[PDB]
Amino acid sequence: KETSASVPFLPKPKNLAGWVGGETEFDPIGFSNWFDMKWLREAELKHGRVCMMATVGFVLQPYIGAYPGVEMPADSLQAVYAAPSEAWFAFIFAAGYIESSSYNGKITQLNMFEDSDRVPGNLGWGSTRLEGMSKEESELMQLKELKNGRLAMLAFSGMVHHNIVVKGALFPLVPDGWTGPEPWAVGSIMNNMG
Amino acid sequence: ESELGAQAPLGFFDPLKLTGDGSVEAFKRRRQSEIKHGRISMLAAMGYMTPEITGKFPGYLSPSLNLKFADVPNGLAAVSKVPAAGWAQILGYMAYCETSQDQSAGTPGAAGEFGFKVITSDDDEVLKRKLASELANGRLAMMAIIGMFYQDGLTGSAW
Amino acid sequence: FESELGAQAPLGFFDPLKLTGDGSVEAFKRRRQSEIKHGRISMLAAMGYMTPEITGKFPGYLSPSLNLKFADVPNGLAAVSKVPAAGWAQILGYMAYCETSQDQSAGTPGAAGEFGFKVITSDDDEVLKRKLASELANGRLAMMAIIGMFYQDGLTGSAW
Amino acid sequence: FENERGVQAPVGYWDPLGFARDGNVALFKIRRATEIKHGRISMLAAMGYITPEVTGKFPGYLSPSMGLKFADIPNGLAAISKVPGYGWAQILGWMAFCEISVDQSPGKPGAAGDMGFKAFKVTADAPETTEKKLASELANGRLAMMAIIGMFFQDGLTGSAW
Ligand code: CLA
Ligand code: CLA
Ligand SMILES: CC(=O)O[C@H]1CC(C)(C)C(=C=C/C(C)=C/C=C/C(C)=C/C=C/C=C(C)/C=C/C=C(C)/C=C/[C@@]23O[C@]2(C)C[C@@H](O)CC3(C)C)[C@](C)(O)C1
Ligand code: KC1
Ligand code: KC1
Ligand SMILES: CC1=C(C#C/C(C)=C/C=C/C(C)=C/C=C/C=C(C)/C=C/C=C(C)/C=C/[C@@]23O[C@]2(C)C[C@@H](O)CC3(C)C)C(C)(C)C[C@H](O)C1
Prior knowledge:
Bound molecules: chlorophyll A, the ligand CC(=O)O[C@H]1CC(C)(C)C(=C=C/C(C)=C/C=C/C(C)=C/C=C/C=C(C)/C=C/C=C(C)/C=C/[C@@]23O[C@]2(C)C[C@@H](O)CC3(C)C)[C@](C)(O)C1, Chlorophyll c1, ligand DD6
Oligomer: part of a larger assembly
Strand content of chain D: under 5%
Radius of gyration of chain D: 19 Å
Largest sheet of chain A: none
Helix content of chain A: 40-55%
């Protein structure tokens, strides 16, 4: 019978039929059957957008210096420590306002896509560009956004954990005399001879 | 098939014959190849001529690497000076320009029509003049660019 | 547009470049509202820029808490930084009360300077028109006079 | 898009690259609003460079506590550090208030340049005089945009204002 195009050894997941990235119909675990697809798409788009902005910030932070006074550390992980308290409060306020006015308070999984025409991931920021174009082109643009979002999510995770293993900046990859990452500290069930 | 390039003072230049075997879409594909090679050769020749008259324009090239615009030399030397990221961005621009429109046979991209226009006709018969001028300039620039390549390779200097 | 006030015996309908576009009676009404308002403001300004010279500065303090006096605040453009900031705020507040109490939108008495002052007036419509034209002429003269007085204060060291 | 404001005598419908030219009326509305707002902010910046040189810096303090006294502050890409941080915060706050008080978005009158600021008083029932003013606003905005970028570069390269 029907099988998923991406995973040929698994059934074709439903609820992915009419969607931007649904032609590859990749959903092995099957959160499609359990959760509202509108919420899943909104979460995927938001994660991708957040991680794309996060990736360009992580890359460009040690470059574009910082606020007059704070020392943007080469390793972007310590920028949270180097950030001023006022800057953090302004960032939190801006994020709260932006993410709470976007849904008119229906900002929860039970109430967000309950009104009617809440398009998943359409916050109205330049949606007019898609208002023109021709269906297939608009869906192609949305697919470009989705693929870049997934790529940047994985990439930002990789950047963070590279800075963790190297204990340094992102760009000087594999420093001289690397010989592999240091073995992980702290105990485990196998550390006490499990 | 005597069109476009037939404007040449030589004429329908067919040494070693070629395109005599009714190769109409081979002719069109060679038109695409000639247009693309001409455009890239003209870009290259301009980017070789400009860095000597009004030389390397002041600035900076690589934040962490301390590479400036004045550090990178000209000619075939400059190949191994632009950092890996810089060459990556240049080749990515190449890839985006190539993949933006469909270049398959029959498409507007199968004749050099990518919507660049800019220096375009007013639809008053000067379209053929503009196309032929671009074709001739590219044809000349191809041999010019290969000659400059050989000069840099043998002499060693950018000239 | 000759018969709508102004247009006094000196010269005629003075508009070297204005009102020649299309007439646009409502644009002329807006400009007349602005002219009457500017004329009243400039008449007050000229009177209050020449009076501290004809007559001594008011007997008092104008700021008992800050120990200022009407007599130790320099007359003219030097008074903007000397009159207390709260005093300027109150002056602007009275101006805002004048400008916001009665409506000044188009097609209203406020659009022709008709707020209800009524002190200098009459009942003979011809005399009403004569007094209105006199107000407009005095206002234009006061506009030019107060601008000249401001520039005399600025270019020179003080008033006059 | 050849009948809108903009297109004029020196050059016609100017489009060397491929922007617009494919319908997309909403995209053109976005680009026109962007052009108008950029021209306005530019014109303001152009004046903010020319005036402190033609007349002179303002007669005041700008910081009675810190005593910056206006005139101490230089003019252009160097006041960014001299003007107090709270002063820049207040300037950006006024700009943000100008942005958020109106509701620039599809269809509503704030998306075509009408930001409620009804100064430069132009009357109703007299078009083709409002339109001339709007076209002049567009042209002066374009000229001022190029000019202000040139002034940025002049200050940066020459190391000081002009
Ligand atoms: C606030 C200023 C102001 C305004 C709005 C008006 C408005 C008007 N005047 Mg008027 N006027 C003024 C000042 C003003 N006047 C002054 C000061 C004088 C004395 C010279 C006059 C003398 C005058 C006469 C003699 C007549 C009018 C008339 C009119 C009406 C028709 C003309 C018109 O459309 O002009 C519109 C308004 C203007 C064009 C004013 C523009 C001001 C320019 C742009 C700036 C000038 C700057 C200044 C010279 C230098 C200042 C210093 C500088 C370096 C910063 C109209 C209602 C005519 C009338 O009654 O029609 C029925 C008429 O016959 N006026
Ligand atoms: C923010 C800049 C901006 C924007 C969005 C627009 C938008 C528009 N212009 Mg416009 N214009 C501008 C600046 C801008 N203009 C400036 C500065 C000039 C003076 C040179 C003009 C001169 C002009 C003419 C003469 C005409 C237009 C027209 C148009 C419309 C046609 C659509 C179009 O091509 O726009 C797309 C907008 C863009 C592509 C802006 C992109 C900017 C590029 C990508 C960045 C680089 C520009 C510059 C070289 C960089 C300088 C700084 C650098 C050194 C760092 C549209 C509403 C036409 C019209 O009215 O149609 C009805 C028309 O005939 N414009
Ligand atoms: C130390 C020292 O001083 O020595 C110097 C030496 C030197 C040379 C000066 C140097 C240099 C400079 C350079 C960079 C020289 C470059 C030379 C190039 C790029 C040669 C590419 C040829 C590609 C061709 C012919 C593609 C051809 C494609 C063809 C023919 C297609 C052919 C078709 O048959 C195909 C494929 C299908 C047919 O149906 C149709 C046709 C068209 C016939 C050095 C290396 O730096 C050092
Ligand atoms: C009946 C209502 C009323 C009261 C009760 C009142 C009282 C005080 N006025 Mg005020 N006032 C008006 C109304 C009233 N004023 C009106 C209609 C105007 C016309 C615009 C006006 C004008 C000014 C100006 C120009 C100044 C001024 C001030 C003070 C002052 C000083 C306080 C202190 O210094 O002890 C006190 C107590 C001076 C100032 O500095 O206020 C801080 C000053 O400069 N006032
Ligand atoms: C009516 C409300 C209002 C008040 C009451 C007020 C008062 C003060 N303003 Mg402000 N202001 C606006 C509104 C008000 N300002 C508006 C709409 C703008 C347009 C963007 C604006 C602009 C600036 C700039 C550019 C600067 C500035 C500052 C100060 C300052 C000095 C404090 C100190 O130095 O003692 C004081 C007391 C300067 C500064 O020093 O801030 C620390 C500074 O640089 N302001
Ligand atoms: C939408 C919208 C707008 C917009 C917009 C915006 C902001 C669009 C932004 C798009 C953006 C910002 C997209 C970023 C992608 C980043 C990616 C894919 C990261 C790749 C990173 C990868 C693939 C991996 C990197 C590695 O690091 C890893 C993992 C390990 C390292 O050891 C090695 C390296 C470094 C190689 C307008 C136009 C402004 C207005 C309009 O109205 C509304």
